[PDB]
Write a protein that binds this ligand. Structure first.
Ligand SMILES: *[C@@H]1O[C@H](CO)[C@@H](O)[C@H](O)[C@H]1NC(C)=O
Lengths: 49, 42
């Protein structure tokens, strides 16, 4: 990379940040899946979802 | 600061090179706060 200055910008979140993003969507897949819109939450037992 | 090249120094050195996961910064100062709306991505 340095041989002709091939600087790679790291993604502007550290790996843990989109890890927590994936965590949030993994917690909310059931949490959205009962009613249209993004108003309430639906943290139902996942098997019931 | 020893072995430089290109143009001159952009240095206002007076306090510690901060060690970061993105390397090390001259000019910043260590702190631990929280910002959810960052405008300068380092
Ligand atoms: C700030 O100080 C803490 C305490 O040792 C250290 O863990 C951290 O890496 C420091 N951060 C920077 C940017 O110097």
């Amino acid at each position: 990379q340095y041989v002709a200055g091939y600087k790679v910008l790291p993604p502007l979140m550290d790996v843990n940040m989109e890890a927590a993003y994936t965590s949030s969507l993994l917690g909310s897949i059931a949490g959205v899946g009962w009613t249209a819109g993004l108003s309430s939450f639906a943290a139902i037992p996942f098997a019931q979802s | 600061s020893s072995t430089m090249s290109q143009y001159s120094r952009s240095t206002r050195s007076m306090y510690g090179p901060l060690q970061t996961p993105v390397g090390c910064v001259l000019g910043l100062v260590n702190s631990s706060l929280f910002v959810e709306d960052c405008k300068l991505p380092l």
